[PDB]
Design an enzyme around this catalytic site. Structure first.
Site, PDB file in Angstrom:
ATOM      1  N   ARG A  38      -2.623  25.270  43.596  1.00  0.00           N
ATOM      2  CA  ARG A  38      -1.934  25.795  44.767  1.00  0.00           C
ATOM      3  C   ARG A  38      -1.067  24.732  45.432  1.00  0.00           C
ATOM      4  O   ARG A  38       0.007  25.036  45.958  1.00  0.00           O
ATOM      5  CB  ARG A  38      -2.936  26.345  45.780  1.00  0.00           C
ATOM      6  CG  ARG A  38      -2.280  27.264  46.799  1.00  0.00           C
ATOM      7  CD  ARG A  38      -3.176  27.529  47.983  1.00  0.00           C
ATOM      8  NE  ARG A  38      -2.518  28.404  48.950  1.00  0.00           N
ATOM      9  CZ  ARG A  38      -2.876  28.503  50.225  1.00  0.00           C
ATOM     10  NH1 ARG A  38      -3.891  27.779  50.681  1.00  0.00           N
ATOM     11  NH2 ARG A  38      -2.223  29.321  51.043  1.00  0.00           N
ATOM     12  N   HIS A  42       2.862  25.210  46.376  1.00  0.00           N
ATOM     13  CA  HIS A  42       3.437  24.975  47.692  1.00  0.00           C
ATOM     14  C   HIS A  42       4.382  23.782  47.729  1.00  0.00           C
ATOM     15  O   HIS A  42       5.193  23.658  48.645  1.00  0.00           O
ATOM     16  CB  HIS A  42       2.338  24.824  48.743  1.00  0.00           C
ATOM     17  CG  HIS A  42       1.761  26.133  49.189  1.00  0.00           C
ATOM     18  ND1 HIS A  42       0.917  26.250  50.272  1.00  0.00           N
ATOM     19  CD2 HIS A  42       1.931  27.387  48.708  1.00  0.00           C
ATOM     20  CE1 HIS A  42       0.594  27.521  50.441  1.00  0.00           C
ATOM     21  NE2 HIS A  42       1.195  28.231  49.504  1.00  0.00           N
ATOM     22  N   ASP A  43       4.283  22.894  46.746  1.00  0.00           N
ATOM     23  CA  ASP A  43       5.195  21.765  46.716  1.00  0.00           C
ATOM     24  C   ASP A  43       6.539  22.266  46.203  1.00  0.00           C
ATOM     25  O   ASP A  43       7.581  22.044  46.821  1.00  0.00           O
ATOM     26  CB  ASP A  43       4.683  20.649  45.795  1.00  0.00           C
ATOM     27  CG  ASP A  43       5.694  19.525  45.635  1.00  0.00           C
ATOM     28  OD1 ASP A  43       6.557  19.377  46.527  1.00  0.00           O
ATOM     29  OD2 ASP A  43       5.629  18.784  44.631  1.00  0.00           O
ATOM     30  N   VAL A  46       9.104  24.430  48.337  1.00  0.00           N
ATOM     31  CA  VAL A  46       9.750  23.800  49.488  1.00  0.00           C
ATOM     32  C   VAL A  46      10.551  22.593  49.022  1.00  0.00           C
ATOM     33  O   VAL A  46      10.000  21.518  48.779  1.00  0.00           O
ATOM     34  CB  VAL A  46       8.718  23.361  50.553  1.00  0.00           C
ATOM     35  CG1 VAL A  46       9.437  22.841  51.791  1.00  0.00           C
ATOM     36  CG2 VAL A  46       7.829  24.542  50.929  1.00  0.00           C
ATOM     37  N   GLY A  48      11.769  22.168  46.258  1.00  0.00           N
ATOM     38  CA  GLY A  48      11.472  21.842  44.875  1.00  0.00           C
ATOM     39  C   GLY A  48      10.223  20.999  44.733  1.00  0.00           C
ATOM     40  O   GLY A  48       9.636  20.574  45.726  1.00  0.00           O
ATOM     41  N   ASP A  50       8.892  18.000  44.599  1.00  0.00           N
ATOM     42  CA  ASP A  50       9.262  16.629  44.934  1.00  0.00           C
ATOM     43  C   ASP A  50       8.168  15.902  45.711  1.00  0.00           C
ATOM     44  O   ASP A  50       8.429  14.885  46.361  1.00  0.00           O
ATOM     45  CB  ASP A  50      10.532  16.665  45.785  1.00  0.00           C
ATOM     46  CG  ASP A  50      10.344  17.460  47.072  1.00  0.00           C
ATOM     47  OD1 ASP A  50       9.272  18.085  47.250  1.00  0.00           O
ATOM     48  OD2 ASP A  50      11.272  17.470  47.904  1.00  0.00           O
ATOM     49  N   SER A  52       6.954  16.572  48.387  1.00  0.00           N
ATOM     50  CA  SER A  52       7.225  16.540  49.823  1.00  0.00           C
ATOM     51  C   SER A  52       5.998  16.976  50.616  1.00  0.00           C
ATOM     52  O   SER A  52       5.758  16.491  51.721  1.00  0.00           O
ATOM     53  CB  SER A  52       8.427  17.429  50.174  1.00  0.00           C
ATOM     54  OG  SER A  52       8.167  18.802  49.926  1.00  0.00           O
ATOM     55  N   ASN A  70      -0.022  26.229  55.043  1.00  0.00           N
ATOM     56  CA  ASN A  70      -0.819  25.074  54.627  1.00  0.00           C
ATOM     57  C   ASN A  70      -1.946  24.697  55.580  1.00  0.00           C
ATOM     58  O   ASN A  70      -3.025  24.297  55.143  1.00  0.00           O
ATOM     59  CB  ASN A  70       0.064  23.834  54.448  1.00  0.00           C
ATOM     60  CG  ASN A  70       0.955  23.925  53.235  1.00  0.00           C
ATOM     61  OD1 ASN A  70       0.524  24.367  52.175  1.00  0.00           O
ATOM     62  ND2 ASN A  70       2.197  23.488  53.377  1.00  0.00           N
ATOM     63  N   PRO A 139       5.484  32.233  50.863  1.00  0.00           N
ATOM     64  CA  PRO A 139       5.194  33.651  51.082  1.00  0.00           C
ATOM     65  C   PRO A 139       3.861  33.828  51.799  1.00  0.00           C
ATOM     66  O   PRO A 139       3.029  32.918  51.813  1.00  0.00           O
ATOM     67  CB  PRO A 139       5.185  34.223  49.667  1.00  0.00           C
ATOM     68  CG  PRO A 139       4.680  33.080  48.846  1.00  0.00           C
ATOM     69  CD  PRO A 139       5.428  31.897  49.428  1.00  0.00           C
ATOM     70  N   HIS A 170      -4.255  33.628  41.202  1.00  0.00           N
ATOM     71  CA  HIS A 170      -5.350  34.167  41.996  1.00  0.00           C
ATOM     72  C   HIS A 170      -6.493  34.670  41.117  1.00  0.00           C
ATOM     73  O   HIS A 170      -7.325  35.473  41.551  1.00  0.00           O
ATOM     74  CB  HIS A 170      -4.825  35.273  42.921  1.00  0.00           C
ATOM     75  CG  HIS A 170      -3.938  34.761  44.017  1.00  0.00           C
ATOM     76  ND1 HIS A 170      -3.174  35.592  44.809  1.00  0.00           N
ATOM     77  CD2 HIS A 170      -3.688  33.501  44.447  1.00  0.00           C
ATOM     78  CE1 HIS A 170      -2.492  34.867  45.677  1.00  0.00           C
ATOM     79  NE2 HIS A 170      -2.786  33.594  45.481  1.00  0.00           N
ATOM     80  N   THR A 225     -14.313  37.062  37.524  1.00  0.00           N
ATOM     81  CA  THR A 225     -14.610  35.680  37.146  1.00  0.00           C
ATOM     82  C   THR A 225     -13.986  34.753  38.189  1.00  0.00           C
ATOM     83  O   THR A 225     -12.896  34.206  37.991  1.00  0.00           O
ATOM     84  CB  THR A 225     -14.067  35.338  35.736  1.00  0.00           C
ATOM     85  OG1 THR A 225     -12.669  35.644  35.661  1.00  0.00           O
ATOM     86  CG2 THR A 225     -14.814  36.133  34.679  1.00  0.00           C
ATOM     87  N   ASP A 230      -8.417  33.277  33.777  1.00  0.00           N
ATOM     88  CA  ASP A 230      -8.247  34.292  32.747  1.00  0.00           C
ATOM     89  C   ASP A 230      -7.416  35.454  33.282  1.00  0.00           C
ATOM     90  O   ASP A 230      -6.955  35.416  34.421  1.00  0.00           O
ATOM     91  CB  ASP A 230      -9.623  34.776  32.279  1.00  0.00           C
ATOM     92  CG  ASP A 230     -10.515  35.196  33.433  1.00  0.00           C
ATOM     93  OD1 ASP A 230      -9.982  35.436  34.538  1.00  0.00           O
ATOM     94  OD2 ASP A 230     -11.747  35.292  33.235  1.00  0.00           O
TER      95      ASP A 230
END
Ligand code: HEM
Ligand SMILES: [Ca+2]
Ligand SMILES: [Ca+2]
Length: 306
Positions: A38, A42-43, A46, A48, A50, A52, A70, A139, A170, A225, A230
């Site tokens: 995750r 999230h990197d 935002v 790209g 990088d 950040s 976050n 999102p 997920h 699971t 999977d």
């Protein structure tokens, strides 16, 4: 151009060091693989991929860690620090935090039982963090399918396959009760639960997330699971058992004419899902990277070099 062999000469053992770190951490924290994947997502969404998101606060810019998507949610930062230190020891000033996090995400997926592949490398680290951009680009679980599609297209992922395959993240990990309370008791101000949520599962979730209860309580994204990577996530959607609104909309939204067949295809074949996941993961990992001499090879992922 990013290439999988970027560190084959300068730091051939990077992938193994990253893997070792995650294996060690998984013993005390079985959720870390999910958390790390995750962080990469999230990197990348935002400015790209990088790194950040790894930067802490400074008097000139706020940390993305306080973004709505976050704050009190993103985790595993100390683990990234640990592997970075280990890699710096083996290969001083060589591997960027952006690449480290990308490798960490891939290794996390593989360790959890997912596909194995070599990610493109060569990314460099940002010189600043983007809190406002994170608030605008990440999102949210309450997004409609059109909004989810808009969010992915906004960062460069135009394909519905990108959205459906990456949502497969997920298939493991946790989610706080706060994000499904509306679906359970008052969806869209109707005073009723989300009709797209299986009524038997509705009862189960209500028991885990009672009204006026602990909103920070954690629930598994995949009831089949919980910690294995999977295709069970898609089988759940077909039975109206997606946990959050954004999950179930891939299968039940009035705008899901294009996503329904993808959900079905991924639920029907692990191979189909895994292939699409790798394809989508590499596309996400290719979002506006800094390369060549742009940016830096951050020594401490929490701060820009000085
Ligand atoms: C399509 C839009 C998406 C939305 C709206 C969304 C939303 C969320 C939310 C609400 C959580 C729960 C956070 C918490 O309770 O603290 C979460 C967790 C998670 N998400 Fe997503 N997500 C999306 C896409 C993705 C993608 C593309 C990936 C990665 C490929 C991903 C991987 C994960 C993982 C593995 C977790 C569990 C993390 C942990 O347990 O620490 N998500 N997501
Ligand atoms: Ca970023
Ligand atoms: Ca699973």
């Amino acid at each position: 151009q990013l290439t999988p062999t970027f560190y084959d000469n300068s730091c051939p053992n990077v992938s193994n060091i990253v893997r070792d770190t995650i294996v060690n951490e998984l013993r005390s924290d079985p959720r870390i693989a999910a958390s790390i994947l995750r962080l990469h997502f999230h990197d990348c969404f935002v400015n790209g991929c990088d790194a950040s998101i790894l930067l802490d606060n400074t008097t000139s810019f706020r940390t993305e860690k306080d973004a709505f998507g976050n704050a009190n949610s993103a985790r595993g930062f100390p683990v990234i620090d640990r592997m970075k230190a280990a890699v710096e020891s083996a290969c001083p000033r060589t591997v960027s935090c952006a690449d480290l996090l990308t490798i960490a995400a891939q290794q996390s997926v593989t360790l959890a039982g997912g596909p194995s592949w070599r990610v493109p490398l060569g990314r460099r680290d940002s010189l600043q963090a983007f809190l406002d951009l994170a608030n605008a680009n990440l999102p949210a679980p309450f997004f409609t399918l059109p909004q989810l599609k808009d969010s992915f297209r906004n960062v460069g992922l135009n394909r519905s396959s990108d959205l459906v395959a990456l949502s497969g993240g997920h298939t493991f990990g946790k989610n706080q009760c706060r994000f499904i309370m509306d679906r359970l008791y008052n969806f869209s101000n109707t005073g009723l639960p989300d009709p797209t949520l299986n009524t038997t599962y509705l009862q189960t979730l209500r028991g885990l997330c009672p009204l006026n209860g602990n909103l920070s309580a954690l629930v598994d994204f995949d009831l089949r699971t919980p910690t294995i990577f999977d295709n069970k996530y898609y089988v759940n959607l077909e039975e109206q058992k997606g946990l959050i609104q954004s999950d179930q909309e891939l299968f039940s939204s009035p705008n899901a004419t294009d996503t329904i067949p993808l959900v079905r295809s991924f639920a029907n074949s692990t191979q189909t899902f895994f292939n699409a996941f790798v394809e989508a993961m590499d596309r996400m990992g290719n979002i506006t990277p800094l390369t060549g001499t742009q940016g830096q090879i951050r020594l401490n992922c929490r701060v820009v070099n000085s």
